[model samples]
Target: AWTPLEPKLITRLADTVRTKGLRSPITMAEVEALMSSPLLPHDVTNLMRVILGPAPYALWMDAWGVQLQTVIAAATRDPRHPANGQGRGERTNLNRLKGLADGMVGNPQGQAALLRPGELVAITASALQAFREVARLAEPWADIMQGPSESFVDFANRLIKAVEGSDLPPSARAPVIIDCFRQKSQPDIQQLIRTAPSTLTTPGEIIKYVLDRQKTA
Candidate 1:
C-alpha cells in the first residue's frame, strides 16, 4: 500500500510555492533542477520529489488583486459594451463580466474582454461594493471571501461620468471616457483617448473595475 504524505511537508511545499512563485504541480524535473542549485538546502532538495507537488486553488487574491486592478482600470476607461444598447448590449455586458470573473477565479480565457466600456465599468464597480459590504458585516469573512473584479470596472466607468459631468463639451468628455476603457480592452493598440493622465482624478474607479472582474471571474 502507498504511504500517505505528511501534512507538514505538504504545508511546507505549499508555502514554498506561494513565496517562490513556483509553477503549480511541481514536476520531478523541477525538483532536480532545484537540487542542482547550490542555494537550496540539501534536506529540502533530497525530498523535493516527495514534498513538492500540486497545490489546489493557488491563485493569491492579493497579488491577483493588483493585476485585476490594472486590467479593470484599462477596461473602465474604454469599455467595449455593444452599442445596440438594449437586449444585445445587456447580454454582451453580462457575458463579458462573466468571462472576466471566470478568468479571475481560475477559468480559461478569463483575461478576454466580455463586456463593452460603459456596461463593463458599471457592472464591475457595483459587484465590488456588494462584496465589500459583505466583508464588512462578518469579521471572519476573509476565510470565505468573494471576487470583486467586475465591480472595479463598473466603478471606473461611473467615475468617468462623474468627472465629465453634464455640461462639459460632449466631444471632449466623450472621447476621454471612450479612450479610458478602450485602452484596457485593446492593449495591443495605442490608447484611444487623448486626455492627460493627470485628468484621471479617480483611482477608485480602477479599484472597482478590478473588483467587478473578480465577481465575474
Candidate 2:
C-alpha cells in the first residue's frame, strides 16, 4: 500500500514543479536532489499523477489547470492576503484575480494553461468583464496630479483614496505618492521633500507633515 503524502510535502513538491516548470530536466534533477528516497522515472511520473490528478502529460504541459490550482492555493493559504482589512473582501478577491490575469500577459505558457481546461470561452468573457470594472474604478486617478488651488493635504488625501482598493503594494504605492508631492510642491518644500521622503514612512505621517507645514505657513 502507498503511504499517504503529507499536505506540506505535497505543497513543497508543487512549488518545486512550478519553480522549475513541469517535467523539465531541471525539475527532475531538483526533485531527485530533494527526495529522501530514490524514485525511478516511473515513480516520479506516478507521484505527479497522484498530486496533480490523472490529466495527460500534454495537458499538464499546457498548465492551465495547474496555474488556476496554484493561484487558488496561494490565495487560500494566506488569510492576510492583499485587501484583507478595511472592510473590502471583494477587493481582495479582485486583487488576486487580477494577479492571475496579469500573469498571463507576455507568458505564452500561462496563456496556454488558461486554454487547456476548455474554459477558454468563459474565462475570456469573465476576464474582459473584470477588466472593464477595474478600468471604470481607476478612471478618477487617470490624472492624479494636484490642481493649482488644491492644498497639499487635500491632494494627498485624494491620492490616498484613489489607491484605496488597488492591488499596488504599500511599499511601491508610498513612493509614487511622495514623488507626486515632490513634483507639485514649490522649492520651499524641496528640503522637506528630500529629507522627509526617507523619514515619513506611512501615509498618515506623510499627510501630517503637510498639515503641520500649513499650520506654520
Candidate 3:
C-alpha cells in the first residue's frame, strides 16, 4: 500500500511516525532531510531514537564493522519492536513502519550502499553550490583573504558558521548569508562567481579548486 500511487506521502507519513511518533506526527521536513542526505548510520540512529529509544539504538550502530546496515538487519529481526504484547492495531502500525525501513534497504536505487569516508562526497556535492558561492567570495570576490595554510573548507565553514546563528529568518538563514556575501564581496569576486563552474558538476575538483585558490590567498 506504500508504493506507486501515493507512495511519497503515505510512506512518508508512516516513516515519520516510525521515526517520530504520535506526539510530533512528524513534520515531514524530516522527509526532505532523509531524502536530501545519504542514509548514514547517524540517520538510522535518529530514527531508532524515536522507535527504540537511545539505549537499544546504540546497540544498532558502532564506532566498528558493526555498522548501520549490520545493525538494521539485526534489528529487523530483533523481536523487540512492535514490542511484546501490543494490541493488534499497534502491532500492525509498527509492521507498516518496519516495512518502510526494510524497503529502503531492499530497494536498489535507495541509499543501500555502505556509507564511509568517501560516501560523504555526494553529501558535499549536495551543498557545494551554496558553499562555493561563499568560499570564493572570501578570496577573489570579496577581498576577505583566507587564513594562511587554513583549510578552505574550514574557513568556508567558519564564514557560514557565523551567519548560521546570526540574525536571519528561520527558513532562509543561508539566504541571508548568501546575500551578505553578495553585499560584501567586491566586483571581481562577483564577476568571478558569475563565471564559476555551474552547479551539479563534479564535487571533488570544485572543492579542490576552492581550497587551492583560497588557501593560496
Candidate 4:
C-alpha cells in the first residue's frame, strides 16, 4: 500500500526474495532507494520484513550485522580504497538497518564473532569512530611535500596545521611526521631524524623542533 514506489516493485520484490532465498534480496544501495522514497518508515520496515518471509528474520538480523562489521572494518582500516568516505552517503540506509537490529528483543551474538553486533546503531557508530580515526591517520598529512617554489615557512605552516587539525594519538602521529618530513626536506630531515628519536617523540615536540630550526638556522 506504499504510494511513492510502484506497488509493482513491492509485489516483484516479494517474489524476488522468494527466488533469492534471503541472500540479500536488497542491498544497502536498494535500501537507500527504498528509504529515499516518500514511503513511511512503517512501509520501509514492512518491505524488509517481506524479504524475510515468516521464518527467518533472525537470520536477516545476522546478515545485516555481519555485513556491518565487514564494511565497518573496511571503513576503518582500508585507507587506500577508492571509495572516499566509504559509507558517506549511505548512512541513512545503515541507520534503518541499525534500527531494525536494535528493535529486536534480546541481543544475539553475530556468527563467527570478532564483532559482537549489539545494537547495529552501536555497530555503525562504533565503526565510524574508528573509521574517522584511521582516516585521520592516513589522510590529512598526505600531501606533505613542499612545493618546488615554496619556502620553508610556507611548508612548515601547512605541515603543522595539517598535523594540528588531524586527530591521532602521539604514537601514531610521531612516526608519520618523521617519514613525511624526510620526504620534503632532506637537510632538515637529517636534523629531525637525529633529534626526532629522543626529542621529537610527539606531534607538538616535532613541531617545536621545526620552529626552533626555523628561528635559529
Point to the candidate with the largest lDDT. Answer: 4
Which residue segments of model 1 deviate by more than 4 Å?
1-90, 93-95, 100-111, 140-217
lDDT of 4 by residue, 139-173 (tens): 36886777756666677678866765666665576
Question: What does candidate 3's lDDT look like per residue over 63-132, in tens digits?
Answer: 2222323333543454343222233332222222222444444442343342232333323232223222
**TM-score of candidate 4 on Cα atoms, chains taken together:** 0.32
Worst 10 residues of 2 by lDDT: 115-124
Q: What is the overall TM-score of model 2 with all chains considered together? A: 0.32
TM-score of each: 0.21, 0.32, 0.24, 0.32
Off by over 4 Å in 3: 1-155, 185-188, 197-209, 212-217
Cα lDDT of model 2 by residue, 1-217, tens digit: 2233465766776677656554445554544443444222223334455444344433442343444444446545655433233344432332233234444544444544433222332233333233233333333443677665666767777776776535667567767666666665555554565666457766677667866765343
Put the candidates in TM-score order, highest first.
Answer: 2, 4, 3, 1
Give one digit per residue, the lDDT tens place, for model 1 in 28-123: 233334334221111222233344342211222232244335444654454443322444333332234334333333332233233244443443
Ranking by lDDT: 4, 2, 3, 1
Kindly report which residue stretches of model 4 are placed more than 4 angstroms away from their true locations once superposed. Answer: 1-144, 153-171, 186-198, 215-217
Model 1 lDDT, residue 150, Cα: 32
Clash pairs (backbone) in predicted model 2:
64-113
lDDT, candidate 4, at 5 = 55
